[PDB]
Amino acid sequence: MRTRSTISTPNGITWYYEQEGTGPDIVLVPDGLGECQMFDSSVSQIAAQGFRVTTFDMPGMSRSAKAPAETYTEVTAQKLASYVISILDALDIKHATVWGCSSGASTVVALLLGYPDRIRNAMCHELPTKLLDHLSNTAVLEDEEISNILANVMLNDVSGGSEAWQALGVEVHARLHKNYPVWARGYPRTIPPSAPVQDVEALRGKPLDWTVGAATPTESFFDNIVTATKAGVNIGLLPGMAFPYVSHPDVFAKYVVETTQKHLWNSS
Amino acid sequence: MRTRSTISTPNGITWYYEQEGTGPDIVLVPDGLGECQMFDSSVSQIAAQGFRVTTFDMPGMSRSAKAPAETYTEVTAQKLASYVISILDALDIKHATVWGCSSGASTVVALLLGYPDRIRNAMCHELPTKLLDHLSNTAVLEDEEISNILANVMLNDVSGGSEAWQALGVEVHARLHKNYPVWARGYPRTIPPSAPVQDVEALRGKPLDWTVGAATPTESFFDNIVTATKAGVNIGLLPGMAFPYVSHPDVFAKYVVETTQKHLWNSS
Numbered sequence: 001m002r003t004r005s006t007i008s009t010p011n012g013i014t015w016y017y018e019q020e021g022t023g024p025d026i027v028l029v030p031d032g033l034g035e036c037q038m039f040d041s042s043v044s045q046i047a048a049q050g051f052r053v054t055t056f057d058m059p060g061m062s063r064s065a066k067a068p069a070e071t072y073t074e075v076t077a078q079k080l081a082s083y084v085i086s087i088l089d090a091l092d093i094k095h096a097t098v099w100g101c102s103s104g105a106s107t108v109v110a111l112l113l114g115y116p117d118r119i120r121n122a123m124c125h126e127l128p129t130k131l132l133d134h135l136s137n138t139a140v141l142e143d144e145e146i147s148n149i150l151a152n153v154m155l156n157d158v159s160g161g162s163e164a165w166q167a168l169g170v171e172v173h174a175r176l177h178k179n180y181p182v183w184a185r186g187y188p189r190t191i192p193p194s195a196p197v198q199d200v201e202a203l204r205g206k207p208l209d210w211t212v213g214a215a216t217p218t219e220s221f222f223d224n225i226v227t228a229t230k231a232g233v234n235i236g237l238l239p240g241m242a243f244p245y246v247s248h249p250d251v252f253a254k255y256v257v258e259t260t261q262k263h264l265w266n267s268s
Numbered sequence: 269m270r271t272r273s274t275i276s277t278p279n280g281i282t283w284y285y286e287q288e289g290t291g292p293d294i295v296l297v298p299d300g301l302g303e304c305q306m307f308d309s310s311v312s313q314i315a316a317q318g319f320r321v322t323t324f325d326m327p328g329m330s331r332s333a334k335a336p337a338e339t340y341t342e343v344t345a346q347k348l349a350s351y352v353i354s355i356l357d358a359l360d361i362k363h364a365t366v367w368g369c370s371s372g373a374s375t376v377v378a379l380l381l382g383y384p385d386r387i388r389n390a391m392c393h394e395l396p397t398k399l400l401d402h403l404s405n406t407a408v409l410e411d412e413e414i415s416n417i418l419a420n421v422m423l424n425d426v427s428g429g430s431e432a433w434q435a436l437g438v439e440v441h442a443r444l445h446k447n448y449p450v451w452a453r454g455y456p457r458t459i460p461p462s463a464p465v466q467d468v469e470a471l472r473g474k475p476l477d478w479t480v481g482a483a484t485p486t487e488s489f490f491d492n493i494v495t496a497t498k499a500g501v502n503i504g505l506l507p508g509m510a511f512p513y514v515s516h517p518d519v520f521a522k523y524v525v526e527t528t529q530k531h532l533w534n535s536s
């Protein structure tokens with residue numbers, strides 16, 4: 001069954017983390033909301049195929065909120081990558097397969113480029129490369145308007161599955177309520193310009209598997225499809241939108257397992 | 269003033285056609301519903317920038333219904349391209365810029381590849397390359413069932429602006445009512461396999477500008493973005509979905525004028 005604990009890294013972060021299984025390491029990095037309970041169903045299904053699965057709340061979010069302001073303000077992909085390397089160091093995970101969506105996508109590409117010895121293969125979903133004035137403008141609002149605006153975006157615009165999103169339960173939505181203002185002030189103004197996609201030739205031949213949400217409006221991640229095709233990187237679709245691990249947890253878990261198995265075959 | 273008239277071609281089709289302005293030729297090929305009143309506002313705005321704009325109902329549809337059955341059954345891009353050449357010959361249009369959406373997109377690419385001397389440049393929008401069972405299965409239903417199903421699909425799924433779609437009015441929606449069964453029996457089973465995008469190298473360096481609808485679900489024209497990028501073809505977005513000339517006629521008109529002006533410059 002599942003380990004649920006905390007670990008402190010020398011950068012001042014106290015992480016909430018979860019771990020299940022034994023075998024090769026698979027690390028599920030959250031989206032910007034930093035909430036690892038969204039992986040709860042898929043952690044068990046992936047672990048049961050012979051993997052050790054690790055996930056965690058992101059610095060300043062949810063149960064990893066005990067952290068210095070630097071880790072949840074002016075956040076970049078490069079910062080997030082150095083923070084994940086810190087918890088992998090503390091958990092003695094030397095070689096890992098990594099999943100990440102949105103800011104997590106930018107984090108896993110930064111990990112694969114920045115720390116190639118540590119990363120077997122990366123799965124990135126919907127990597128945000130463009131500033132959006134309407135997300136950036138939330139940063140200057142009051143806490144309670146931010147939470148009302150962004151809770152409605154998640155539920156009605158980008159969940160890919162409103163009932164599955166609601167079924168996360170009241171405890172999860174109470175933690176997200178407090179994350180929204182932190183995310184607004186620290187993420188949308190600085191994440192997109194940090195996207196590690198400026199150098200197409202740097203992506204060519206890397207063990208990277210790129211997805212976009214099948215139901216996402218084409219304009220949102222059009223640029224991801226162009227970039228992946230130019231770099232020869234494997235690019236495909238998962239069902240739903242920004243949270244395939246919430247909207248379609250069984251399809252998500254099968255994709256993570258089969259993608260990790262394909263790379264374990266290739267490395268021999 | 270706009271010409272609104274008919275003209276007969278030796279293949280047995282009597283075409284309903286419209287034409288406005290003087291200057292270089294721009295030809296607007298309808299989508300599969302074959303209904304050229306959807307271009308009405310855009311024809312005026314494009315002609316006013318110094319172009320002769322021509323459009324027409326497609327064979328067996330709307331006011332071009334007088335035509336042999338061959339022209340609206342087992343329909344391919346290559347068939348529609350030979351029909352468009354027949355009406356350009358009849359109207360003495362020697363060299364034309366062409367636009368087409370959906371089966372029209374397939375048509376304008378088959379025009380550019382098959383009649384390079386006739387085509388200055390082609391704008392293709394949302395080219396259908398994949399068989400869709402839920403569309404192919406309409407073919408075997410009763411006329412009034414096909415029209416009720418496909419009227420609902422156009423309005424609620426792919427119009428990209430339900431208000432502007434309804435504002436096409438009673439007369440247009442009554443012509444579409446009769447087209448739906450004709451389209452269902454002649455198009456969805458034979459159009460996608462005829463998509464001229466199998467040969468990626470044949471597209472490279474051609475005067476082709478490709479768009480997808482910004483609001484269309486990513487899954488629908490993902491393959492277009494991949495193909496255009498592999499061929500090095502200009503690819504971008506228009507607002508809305510399958511009917512940018514209905515949902516956003518001013519943006520559509522500007523796109524057609526600017527794209528044509530760019531190829532007029534590049535030709536000298």
Ligand SMILES: C[C@H]1CCCC(=O)CCC/C=C/c2cc(O)cc(O)c2C(=O)O1
Pocket residue numbers: 031032033101102103104128135158187188189191192242
């Ligand atoms: C929560 C997640 C998906 C849900 C939010 C969503 O899909 C809004 C539109 C796409 C942008 C996401 C995004 C953009 C940023 O600049 C920084 C981010 O951390 C995100 C992001 O993490 O969005």
Ligand SMILES: C[C@H]1CCCC(=O)CCC/C=C/c2cc(O)cc(O)c2C(=O)O1
Pocket residue numbers: 299300301369370371372396403426455456457459460510
């Ligand atoms: C009417 C138009 C856009 C409206 C219909 C629409 O967008 C349905 C999904 C996309 C497929 C369109 C299509 C597929 C075919 O096999 C043959 C066609 O002629 C079309 C087509 O022309 O769809």
